[PDB]
Amino acid sequence: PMFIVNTNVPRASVPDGFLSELTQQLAQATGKPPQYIAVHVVPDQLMAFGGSSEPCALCSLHSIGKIGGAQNRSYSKLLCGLLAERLRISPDRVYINYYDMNAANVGWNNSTFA
């Protein structure tokens, strides 16, 4: 699985352990080993949400399976809670795009997972 956060929160306000915290929580959330989880945080971004420049985040979660109606409602609660406590972002200023990827469309280690 792959999780990306783009935010206007400055770099110095991203805690040093945030990437490892995300990795561990997403491994439990998805039921996949932490070795398979990749995380990417992009601070200091020029963005607005509803026309306002208060702190906000635009995110995406890709995974081969473990994506769906009930699961995505649970992920949103987990991720909003993490962004609220660690980055101080209000949860109504968070978007997360979920992607259920086909194994043939994910490359890794010179091949694909198909």
Ligand X SMILES: O=C(O)Cn1ccc2ccc(-c3cn(-c4ccc(O)c(F)c4)nn3)nc2c1=O
Query: What is the set of active-site residues?
Result: 1
Residue 2 CB, nearest approach to ligand X (Å)? 4
User: Residue 64 annotated as binding?
Assistant: yes
With CB under 5 to 8 Å by kind, the binding choice for 88 among a copy of itself, ligand X, none is none
- Residue 70: which H helix or E strand, with range? helix 69-87
Applying the rule CB under 8 A, the residues between 69 and 98 that interact with a copy of itself are 69, 72-73, 75-77, 79-81, 91-92, 94-98
Contact (CB, 8 A) for 90 and 55: yes
4 is in an annotated binding site: no
